[PDB]
Amino acid sequence: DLGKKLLEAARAGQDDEVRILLANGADVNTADETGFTPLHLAAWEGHLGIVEVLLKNGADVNANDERGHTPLHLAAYTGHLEIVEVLLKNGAGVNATDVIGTAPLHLAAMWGHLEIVEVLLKNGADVNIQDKFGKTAFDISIDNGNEDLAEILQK
């Protein structure tokens, strides 16, 4: 119902409709079939203003989808630096791990998002974290052919 409209409005970037739906009772943390909340989708699509609106309306900054991804996971994956910064300023768990043991630092390094890597480390990213395959952000950097980025992620 309203929750379904809120998810799509956040995905499509309709920030006026997001506010309208929230003003009319829409659950800010509505989750779709796969566990994505409006904050997940806005982070994935790169809608900074909607991220800020949802957070001002009680959104769960650390909501987990069915795979354990938080909004910070999706922002780091898609390379949205401004959203990464805002999420961290709003208490995002910098070292959250998904069901495979992957943290946001793994995903930023997977695609060579250097600025995002620095921000995560600046906010306490732990480089020793290993996913279930034993791969640290350092190792992931090597496997994905991101060598110069592996100097900052040693150990």
Residue numbers in the entry: 13 to 167
Text lifted from the article:
In this paper, we present a strategy to fuse specific, high-affinity protein binders to obtain multivalent or multispecific scaffolds of predetermined geometry. DARPins are used as building blocks to confer the desired specificity to the construct. A series of rigid connector modules replacing the DARPin capping repeats allow to combine the individual DARPin domains in such a way that their distance and angle can be altered to test different geometries, bringing the binding partners of the DARPins into a defined spatial arrangement. The two helices are not just joined end-to-end, but instead the two domains are made to overlap in such a way that the joining helix is stabilized by contacts with the domain cores along its entire length.
To facilitate crystallization of the unliganded constructs, we used the internal repeats of DARPin D12. This DARPin was originally selected to recognize the V3 loop of human immunodeficiency virus envelope glycoprotein gp120. In the context of DARPin-β-lactamase fusions, we observed that the paratope of this DARPin has a high propensity to form major crystal contacts, leading to crystal formation under a wide variety of conditions. The unfused DARPin D12 has been added as reference. In the crystal of unliganded DARPin D12, the paratope-paratope interaction is split into two interfaces (i.e., interacting with different molecules) of 498/473 A2 and 405/438 Å2 of surface buried, equivalent to 71% of all crystal contacts made by D12. Additional interfaces are provided by capping repeats and by bridging Ca2+ ions. In the absence of its ligand, the interactions of DARPin D12 are weak enough for constructs containing this DARPin to remain monomeric during expression and purification. Upon crystallization, the paratope-paratope interactions of this DARPin are strong enough to form prominent crystal contacts under a wide variety of conditions. In summary, DARPin D12 can form five predominant types of interaction with its paratope in arrangements with and without local symmetry, compatible with numerous crystal forms, involving both non-polar and charge interactions, while it shows no dimer formation in solution in any fusion protein under the conditions tested.
